[PDB]
Amino acid sequence: DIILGIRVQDSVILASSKAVTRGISVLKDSDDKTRQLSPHTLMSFAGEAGDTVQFAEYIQANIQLYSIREDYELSPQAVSSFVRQELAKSIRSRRPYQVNVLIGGYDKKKNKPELYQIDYLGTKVELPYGAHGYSGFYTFSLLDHHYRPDMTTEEGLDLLKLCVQELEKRMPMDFKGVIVKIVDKDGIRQVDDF
């Protein structure tokens, strides 16, 4: 259920747990709770079992359809605005998508990273660092203490290590570590030594 995101000076770092639990046991311990919406836009999601991936893959198709149609990459602001609208439409629909998402992207025209937190109701907010569910209860106190806008990607990763360690120490559930991805001017990459 862990979904973390921190925006640093030059890039956005999204961390998400690897564990997948269905009832009594852990089915998988290497799950990737992210979808690349664009070459420079990444979406992390969490929520109900089936809604998270159905919604994420449905969003990814529309963003891909827009990119091919206009031969242009949507800005992270536009993607988040589009994603928020879909969540807002669903929250009052026959079967809502109970999905909480983090949208981290690099705006190639403003040359600035962008991190957007949208909950299943459709509450879009841009933050320097975000988290969904109870993962933000343990991490905001550290981020409020250590975060500075001008951190480099290396300092941001060091800060995520502290946030993840605190989650491991105090949060009861075992989330089997995190997969960390960095959205930079060069695209999306995964940190493997984390």
Place this chain on the structure above:
Amino acid sequence: DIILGIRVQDSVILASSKAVTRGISVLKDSDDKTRQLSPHTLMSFAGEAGDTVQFAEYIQANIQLYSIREDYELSPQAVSSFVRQELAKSIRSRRPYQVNVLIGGYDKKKNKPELYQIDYLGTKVELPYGAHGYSGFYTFSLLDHHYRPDMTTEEGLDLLKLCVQELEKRMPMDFKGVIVKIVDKDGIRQVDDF
């Protein structure tokens, strides 16, 4: 919530989780869920927050009171019979003790280890290896496969490592390792390199 017990040829090995969780966070990660009822009798317990320790300490007082009174150590069979009776009395009382216990002891007169599993209803059963709650769902398949009555304490500890590793892998909750104690002819000792 993990309470494991394996009886080997010469001793009884009891393992219990170190984690204590109250709602949102883990308060303690070094808790000892055991009470020494006699120099050669040890009791592991699990269950509701307050009932486990109130019951365990109440049982320990009576066993200690008997030992001082007759200057004689109750056999593990007698202690388990006494413990079962109190659980049976409580299950149909004003406020039942929702406590599941494992009683491992060394019978100095029969020179044999003894392991007794008693649940909060008062269901006493002697087993070669026992577990309470869902901890037995993951471990019995391994114990049924590897257990042999004539194992040494070292082989029994090696078997607990496999049982604990399986619990770590598949059980969603993080129980912060286990404390392992061995009830032998020489008394009760704790294994620290586990």
Place this chain on the structure above:
Amino acid sequence: TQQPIVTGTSVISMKYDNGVIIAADNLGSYGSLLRFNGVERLIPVGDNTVVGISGDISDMQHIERLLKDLVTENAYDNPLADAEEALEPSYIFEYLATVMYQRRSKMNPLWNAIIVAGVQSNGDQFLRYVNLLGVTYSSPTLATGFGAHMANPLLRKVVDRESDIPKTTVQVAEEAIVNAMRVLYYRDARSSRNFSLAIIDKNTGLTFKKNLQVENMKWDFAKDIKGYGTQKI
């Protein structure tokens, strides 16, 4: 989804050697209030069928309307509507059973229990039951509602099996039905002293007896009962 408001009590019937007999009381109860006393719950459908209905009266009057439409729609472009193509009891029952089940599947049931009693064109007795759930069954004796527990034990002594039908005459069957109605009036709180009785005979045809009266009741033993135990005077 509905509940019954004004209801008719048990309908009882049985087949004898030459036909069938069906009886029902002329009462519509509104709760414990014995409100309406002119309700006719036996519905002749042609010369060889009688449909007895129990339960909700409002749905009973709806079914009664459907049956009169069958008789009309059957006579359309049907010159043999009176001789060789008239409505049989089996055709009428299948229509009602279909309607009752279709309403059930829509969760809008007709809160009724129906007994279709008649004689087929070939002379075979017809006696089938159907209720709000669409459950249908046949027996030498059929009773709905409260009569299944009290009338059937009495009617079944006369015709306990299929082989008993040919040995049961009109008089034996009729007195059994009349006695059963008296027993129902004794022990049924929602029952009336007046009832209608229909006899469908393969020879004499349909004989519909209205305003029959429960008679020869026994109450003289009540004077000797005093208190609920210890009382003596």
Place this chain on the structure above:
Amino acid sequence: SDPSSINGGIVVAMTGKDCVAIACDLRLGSQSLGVSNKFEKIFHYGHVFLGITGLATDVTTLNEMFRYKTNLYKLKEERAIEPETFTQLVSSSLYERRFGPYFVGPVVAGINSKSGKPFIAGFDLIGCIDEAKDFIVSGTASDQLFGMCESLYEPNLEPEDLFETISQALLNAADRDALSGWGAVVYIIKKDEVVKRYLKMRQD
């Protein structure tokens, strides 16, 4: 939810020619989980055998109760309790807690030491004496045992033929009950001796 179905188990008693048979499965579980394959449910208090099914805590509690009661009975009476007398002792004890009842179905089996005739009796959880001349069943698989015992059982079976009938009724009924199995034990009770046998059966 149902206390009598938490632990499973089944007991069956049959009567033969001057012999009684009482058999049970050895499974103890927590709903789906099987905990022990050595949980015997048949206890003897002299020459009278009591098979108790239902909640495992109540089975254990009643064994120590009837051992307590029958032990005091033999000290005051100076003789062992007969099956007929024990049947009423069980019945009254279960009724004494009509409103706090034990969720157990007991099965009494034995041979009256004086008259020498076989005796078996059954019970509900609140003590209705179901005295039967042919067979008694209890436990989760009572439905299976009733049909299984009702077809195989015939009057006046010899002790050797009674063992085949009761064991076959138990094994086949246990095989069709999820919460029963993991071995079975059969007691063949005769006026002069008792034979205890463990049956080979599916361990799933």
Place this chain on the structure above:
Amino acid sequence: GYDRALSIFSPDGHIFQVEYALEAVKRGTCAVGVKGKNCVVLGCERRLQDTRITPSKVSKIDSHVVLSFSGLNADSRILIEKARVEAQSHRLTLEDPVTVEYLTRYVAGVQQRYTQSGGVR
């Protein structure tokens, strides 16, 4: 709504509306495509125009398929949009990008359905 059979058989077996649709194609700007051992080259002929924003002939349907055309420019946008939606729908439903054979069957199928539907040319 409007469901008249615009495409119908002529007394000699010809569907004139379909043949007249071919005449529209022959009047459009010419596109040429030649494929070699390792690549396919799509060329096009252009009829105060702004080259930056005037739509190009070769339109990507997906990251790996390009669709060139000739004929009525307005109609092409309808096919291309349908092709693009299907290409993304195929990935969303089967996780595999459309094969060039698959995409041509869909686009050809759409064109065929318009020669046998009422109220459409």
Place this chain on the structure above:
Amino acid sequence: TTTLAFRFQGGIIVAVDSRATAGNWVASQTVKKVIEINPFLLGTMAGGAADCQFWETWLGSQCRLHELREKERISVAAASKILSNLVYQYKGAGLSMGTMICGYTRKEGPTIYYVDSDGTRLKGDIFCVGSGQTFAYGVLDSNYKWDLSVEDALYLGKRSILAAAHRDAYSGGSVNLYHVTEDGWIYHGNHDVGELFWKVKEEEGSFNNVIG
């Protein structure tokens, strides 16, 4: 119920029990919980028997139609997503499903996709479903290797279901072994758990707590 499917060098081994229970009454002993969607795809029944049997039978037609149109065998990823999408349409309507869509393809290799009624769809090397899944994991997690021989892999699947059958009240009857290879799936027979338990006990010495 206990159904498992794990990937190894020789393909996929699918092992399932055969017990169906209506409460504590064991309705059947010989239920076929593996659904043969194609000569190349295998399903697996857990939870709703009717939902699994009907929709995985329907899924075979969709796979066949893909064959006829594309003239190529449908991938396991596409087959599991066709089922996953449909199972999601009925989410909340009452469907019950836990299944592994096991298949082996040239371009994709051995593949197991776990699809359940929530709409979940997971690719993995080892999956166990049913009441006795935790017991099957215990045996698999310790004895599973990628380099297992076909003979050793078949035994591991057979042994894993035996462990769940022994300890789980709602699992047992018989073990149905399937092996998915490059040329389709192979049925390795039905093994009675009652007979297998005693055979396994003597050869391994395991289940030492069971007398016999």
Place this chain on the structure above:
Amino acid sequence: TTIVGVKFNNGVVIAADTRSTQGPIVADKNCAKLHRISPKIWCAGAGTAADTEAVTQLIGSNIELHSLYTSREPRVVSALQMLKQHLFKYQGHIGAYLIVAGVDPTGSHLFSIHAHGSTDVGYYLSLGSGSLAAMAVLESHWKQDLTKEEAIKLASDAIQAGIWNDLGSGSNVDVCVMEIGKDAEYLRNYLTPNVREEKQKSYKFPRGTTAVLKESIVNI
């Protein structure tokens, strides 16, 4: 269960079926549902089998002690009062529906007690699931000044109606006849209309068919 009481010109007869059911299953095919409260006061109970057996056993004890205390033959009224007061004290939790009949120095009596402690006097009564089926026969055929034979036939016929027509009633008919001048005669299994037919095959297993792990001799 089907139970009936029929008062006739010189006494009272109570009859009952012998089937005991645990839901849809017939636990006991020959349960005795007629219980003694005293030699000439008998009770027949429907509803819960344990409470009917237990309540009558408690009242039967008190009737005997009270009879010894007063040196008098028990009154059926004393059983009714102690029985209804006991049931009322428990506010219907003791689900015992009872027909108490007997003869005492003051004549023959027939009462029914409901689980809540209410009682009624009657010349013919019925309880159990088959009460409506049995009462149909009693209403049809009962008459004043029945002889002992007519009453026994009427009581048995009423029970048979419940046996044949009620699923919860079956097997055999138990009859107890209590006449004022003489002893109560308990006609156990008065009629046995449901004797099972011979089985099509014999299921005697050959010895050695069962597999055995170990054999032991148990000390007594």
Place this chain on the structure above:
Amino acid sequence: TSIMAVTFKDGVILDADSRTTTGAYIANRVTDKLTRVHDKIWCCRSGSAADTQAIADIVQYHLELYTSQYGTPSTETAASVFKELCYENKDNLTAGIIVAGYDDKNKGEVYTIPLGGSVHKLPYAIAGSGSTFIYGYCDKNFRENMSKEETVDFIKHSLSQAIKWDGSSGGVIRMVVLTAAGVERLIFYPDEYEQL
């Protein structure tokens, strides 16, 4: 049910039907709902059969104990004993009682004790399920100091309509006439009152 009590010139008449129902089934159709709590004090019982029978038994025990110690009680005292049991246990005993009695000084008296446990002295009282259908009839037709014949005719007309319209009321009409001449019991069968 349908119970009724009417004071008249020479005393008081208690009357009731004979039907008791458990749902639609008539458990007993010849019940005697008139209960003697003392020689000239009788009560009619409506509501729960178990509760009313228990109360009547206890009240009879109290009035019997009263008579041995303090002389014969009055109808007011009997109603007072009923009130204490009905009121002090109003949450448990769902009992509605009509108490009628005769004594030389006060002649006939009627006390109704509705479900709440209050006591009301009335010239005539009607209770039970079937009473609701004859509130208008009884009010229009009741007169003070009618003769025994007029009161019996009045009661027969009243209950015949209560029996007619109420499913849970019917059977024979049982009357108890309390006067100086003693206690008289009357019974009217359906063939007598049904065609009034």
Place this chain on the structure above:
Amino acid sequence: TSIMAVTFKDGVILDADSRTTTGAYIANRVTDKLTRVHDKIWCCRSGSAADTQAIADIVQYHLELYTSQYGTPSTETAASVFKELCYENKDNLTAGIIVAGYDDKNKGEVYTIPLGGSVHKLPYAIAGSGSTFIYGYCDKNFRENMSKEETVDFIKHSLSQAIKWDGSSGGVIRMVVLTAAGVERLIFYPDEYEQL
């Protein structure tokens, strides 16, 4: 409420009280519960006010539409239109109706349509909460072919008792007399009927 309809020699009389209550509060004490659905067809409304008013409006629209096409309807036709609305929406509309009307061929007719939606032709009909208290009185006193004066006196006695015993009934007594002479409306105030 308390609504009533009585056929008599020269036609039919519809009558009702005037009180409508929302709990214990009397929302309106002078309500007019007699509704004209056609020139000589009137209906009395009991139960939900919204449902009965909606049904009466729709029935009036249907009978008005019927009259323009098929001539004047009979009281049976008006009751039939009521039944379709009350029956086809019996799960929603909690309406109990008494339909009375006059035509030369059939004279006065009364149709009662209880909560279930069935139709019953009666010589006289009574409905409403207050009707339960005059079932016995009306049955004993109603006669066939009474004069207008006797029927009005009969109705005044009947409703005065329904008003007397029912809290939810009271106010003025409104009557509509349907005869060959036309429609006549009468009103009786409490000072006129209360001391009958």
Place this chain on the structure above:
Amino acid sequence: QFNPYGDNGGTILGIAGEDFAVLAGDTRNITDYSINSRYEPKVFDCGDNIVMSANGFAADGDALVKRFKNSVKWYHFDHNDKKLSINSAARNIQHLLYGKRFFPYYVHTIIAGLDEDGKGAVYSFDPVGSYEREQCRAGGAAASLIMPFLDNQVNFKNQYEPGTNGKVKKPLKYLSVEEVIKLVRDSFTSATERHIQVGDGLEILIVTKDGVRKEFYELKRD
């Protein structure tokens, strides 16, 4: 609130043989604790040597059997009077049952017949439409009373050769049609004794190469 489902009790039993199939069921019809009819046919011959019975809620059992018989008629119309295979019939019923997945036929159905190679076939259906071919299957109220006895006597479960100490199981032999009827009769006679919802008669439909043969046997009526 309206409960659209009922329970008319009864029991059905299908057993498949080497060259035959029997589908048996008691003819009693019940409601609560009352007997509706003592002879209500429950097993029906649906044509093409297929015998079908739906047990449970009678209205749905009648409706499903009525709909299957209709399906067979259209199969003949569509496929030129082609005989409907038992497996084809079984698959067709699954679609009838699952066509009402969210308002199911509250009935457990069994169809018996002969497969294309002439061996007895028995299919049993879950109320929502799961079917699996079986050698023998009892359904209904007394399935638990009947089925364990048939495992022991037909499949020889838990029976070993005498003198081998449980090492050799009793070989499974061929039961003739006559012997199966004895087991069916004794199974239902036993269930009649201990189940209140079973009795009044036993209807057995024998499917064989010659066609469908019907037999009726009386049971206790109490």
